[PDB]
Amino acid sequence: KKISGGSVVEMQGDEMTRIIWELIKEKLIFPYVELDLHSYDLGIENRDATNDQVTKDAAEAIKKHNVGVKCATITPDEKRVEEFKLKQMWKSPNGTIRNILGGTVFREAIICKNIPRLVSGWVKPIIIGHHAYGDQYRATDFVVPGPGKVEITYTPSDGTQKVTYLVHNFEEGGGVAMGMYNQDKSIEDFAHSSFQMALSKGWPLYLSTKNTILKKYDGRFKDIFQEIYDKQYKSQFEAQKIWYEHRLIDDMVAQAMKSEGGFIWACKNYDGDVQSGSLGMMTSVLVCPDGKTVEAEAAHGTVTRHYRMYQKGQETSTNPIASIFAWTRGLAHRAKLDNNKELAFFANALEEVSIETIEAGFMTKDLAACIKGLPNVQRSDYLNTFEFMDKLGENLKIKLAQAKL
Amino acid sequence: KKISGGSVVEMQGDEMTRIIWELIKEKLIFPYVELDLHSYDLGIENRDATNDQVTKDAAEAIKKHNVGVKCATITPDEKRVEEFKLKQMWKSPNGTIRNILGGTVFREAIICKNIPRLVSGWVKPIIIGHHAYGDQYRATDFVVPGPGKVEITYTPSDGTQKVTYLVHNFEEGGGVAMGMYNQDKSIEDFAHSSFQMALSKGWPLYLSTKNTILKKYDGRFKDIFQEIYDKQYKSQFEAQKIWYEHRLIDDMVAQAMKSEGGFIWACKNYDGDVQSDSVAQGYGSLGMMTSVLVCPDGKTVEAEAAHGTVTRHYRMYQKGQETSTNPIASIFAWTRGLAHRAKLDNNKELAFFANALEEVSIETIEAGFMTKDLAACIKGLPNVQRSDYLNTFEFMDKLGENLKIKLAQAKL
């Protein structure tokens, strides 16, 4: 008999990822696990037909069932509106889901011993989580057309005296100015998600800020994380031989480079600054502050360029790893919530099979290019999308047979 | 006779870099060039003894003489205060010098054909620029202790046409808020140094902003850069088959991965130091990363390695243990400074020397003679053998021998 997997919210997607998502379910998941599957079709055509109601319903199902596994989806732009004759330029499903669930997104690149990394010494991945914006949240920027004062004021609701801070006195010429803010609740949610993420992995957590420059703004993140740690998580961390520390950004960057990895890094970037492989190896998880709800997905898109080749009947070599790890992370979380030992073993075995297959020299073109360099990759160095899924399927059957005896 | 090099401001530093700096002068510079050397000792003990007056005097000397070449220095922290029994936790000399000089910092990793790069396709380096804002430049941040309204207002000098913008209405708790700004003059100075660097190198220039999000704030950078390009640099760029293009970070990153390098990237970021740069701190070797502070005037340049004093190697050297410290970034601080001096003075012999030394440095590594950090890039640290590299002194001797040959060949 198959493993009884319980409740999983699954969101089908678009283009190349939609094809790979179906192959994963048919070849890797369904032959071994029976799920009470709450399946939502987030294909662009279905979101258009339902006036995006499907997206909202999927988000509510994740909130109820605690486990979401999502396929990459098309975020409409002008060209997509014309391509599908869309009724509206629908908002990103990821944006809609994040707004309903809340939480922090943690990204992790899957490491294979034979695949070159930025730091060769990295044996274990580094999991990065950013303090992001709640999609509707913004900064108030404007042009300063000429000389004059820019001030920022706070008027207490409690009737106490208003406080005025001079931002800059433009004495000659103009420029630009802006106002930014953060609510304590957002910082607290960021801290809770980071501590829950570290406890779940059994890895230490680092928070980096620029509190030497933004003494009040970044000092608040530093203080809130330390207050929550001391009160709610410190005993739990010590019990798992892990820790939490604040590090100044400059000091944090250098330490990660001389490290073997295996830590969570919560990042509070300097506000207003710009922030930005193989993408097929990058996983993503939205971790809600409750420590109960997660939504897992590949960090890449729908791979439109490969989908166009597939539509023409041309051979493709699309990496399914990030999509497989969305399934394994969701199933591992489900197993943890349900104390399901068989499901926990399966989720770990599938991750090991995926890494082992690549480490044995069977991989898609993107990874063969990492090893050989794109100018020297030959057809014999890689497997096409379907051949690679078949190899994973064969290795998974072998792994699960060895596990039985 | 030696080359008459003119006025150079030199700043001596600390630990392992202080040792390399002396080797560079003794083996590579002094046998060929005579300088009117304005030498400042920025060693930690001398900064402590002079109450940091030496740092301020060195900054004023660069402003007077236009050419600065600086050795890495210790930035005091609590452990350093205890180690040297320092009088105060002296501020970073780099911070003090940048505050006095102003300007834009450009960082460039030296490429050798046999050394792996982040992107294999890169044949020519990528030069990344960030503007160096003064210590007087800051965001105005504060704690919001409870519910209430945060607004930001602009009151023009004459008192008319005031505008008040709601930032946020804190309805359920407190948090934090801040006001930030940028002056047109700062953006214009950044644009001028960037366009000029692109022309001086004969390379295209790219600017990245988040103008799709900060439509007014980042739009101003895009427009000032675009205006100065269209008006003052468009024809010169086309003449050299080079171009200026604004690009979003996402687009910039993707293009760079498919690029062969050889371009200047101006990044609008406040937090732009190499220390917070995950790519620069984690790829190959910091021993190959150069830095140049380019002042708005186009006349003043301060060159330095974009790494520290290499304390870990200095500790081994103190125990009499063999070290293999890469002097490339330090040598290029000298060659960039001397090339700038040559340009200001129309000194053809000095310009030739500065270029010849850069060529010798790259050629030596390309011929398979390198320090351990580079041998580890090729072989991987666990598989490096002693025969794959040269120690600090052996590598400097090899460079010295190759420089002598190069300059002798150039004479005939």
Ligand SMILES: NC(=O)c1ccc[n+]([C@@H]2O[C@H](COP(=O)([O-])OP(=O)(O)OC[C@H]3O[C@@H](n4cnc5c(N)ncnc54)[C@H](OP(=O)(O)O)[C@@H]3O)[C@@H](O)[C@H]2O)c1
């Ligand atoms: N989380 C999400 O739902 C999400 C996120 C981002 C974008 N999107 C959507 O995705 C669509 C396409 O976006 P995009 O083309 O900019 O991004 P993308 O799908 O991430 O693909 C960009 C390129 O990265 C490479 N790549 C990405 N994933 C790969 C994989 N699994 N295997 C092999 N190569 C892979 C391919 O490079 P080569 O072309 O060199 O082969 C591909 O053309 C858009 O409609 C966008 O809205 C969705």
Ligand SMILES: NC(=O)c1ccc[n+]([C@@H]2O[C@H](COP(=O)([O-])OP(=O)(O)OC[C@H]3O[C@@H](n4cnc5c(N)ncnc54)[C@H](OP(=O)(O)O)[C@@H]3O)[C@@H](O)[C@H]2O)c1
């Ligand atoms: N511009 C400046 O004056 C400046 C800049 C940064 C830091 N600092 C100061 O420098 C001191 C030491 O800082 P740190 O140890 O954090 O940074 P670091 O001097 O840059 O050295 C960090 C590590 O990078 C490698 N490395 C750096 N430069 C190298 C070179 N030329 N050749 C070979 N390997 C090289 C070494 O790695 P391995 O250990 O693996 O060999 C070294 O231990 C501190 O007092 C700090 O304040 C000054």
Ligand SMILES: CC(C)(C)CC(C)(C)c1cc(Cn2ccnc2)c(O)c(Cn2ccnc2)c1
């Ligand atoms: C073209 C552009 C934008 C520079 C992107 C690119 C190519 C990814 C890139 C390249 C280098 C240069 N480098 C290579 C080895 N050592 C230094 C960087 O320092 C950063 C830093 N960074 C990280 C994030 N943003 C900037 C990014």
